[PDB]
Design a protein around this nucleic acid. Sequence first.
RNA 1: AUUGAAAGUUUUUUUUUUUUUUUUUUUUUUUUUUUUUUUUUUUUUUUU
Length: 201
Amino acid sequence: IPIKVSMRNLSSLTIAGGSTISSIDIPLNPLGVPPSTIKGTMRTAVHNLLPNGYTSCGEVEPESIREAHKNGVCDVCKLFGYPDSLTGCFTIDVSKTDYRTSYITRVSIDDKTQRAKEGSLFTQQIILPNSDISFTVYYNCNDERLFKLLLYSILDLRYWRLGRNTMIDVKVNNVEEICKSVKCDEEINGILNQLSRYLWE
RNA sequence: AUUGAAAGUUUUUUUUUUUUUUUUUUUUUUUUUUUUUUUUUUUUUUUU
């Protein structure tokens, strides 16, 4: 079930990728925004903002993940996949490319005085705000509670940082096919309506 | 059902301080309010 999600950053969004040829203190990924960044950020938001009636490992160590999975549910961990049990649950791909770029710099003001610290000046590469990013979340499994959890994940992504504490506003450009596919629930309809438009008009 | 897997390149840092668009520069120098015009004409200090 495809989910055509369009996200537009509300600030000077940026991520650090890398390049052998680079000079900016804060690099950028050559392709743009990778699916891994989105997936990890969404998982973090879900764990920190966990909807009622769900379980989250909230662990980085795979051994700790296994220890949490000793009981063995971790609804969030099931949605994002066991380390070595399930092949997968959902996929993220980004098609749009060719973002805008500009080099800015930042300082660190002294505390005792109000002047900039001598030698605390570093630069940062950013993506210009109000730039649209479209990515599709292909959920291949067959489960409604996990699908609702994924929708809650996307919704919570709105109230969450994405790269250098940069605010974002997620928008879903498909409600008709989502309702047509399966489980056009009233709660599902309400959350999809909430995600249908930007939080900030 | 890929040899096979699951991890946000993330956190954290105010491009800030020092500096009066300031001093000097007189809206003055010149030009007669003069110029032609008669306070003039008419009238008996006086009658029954």
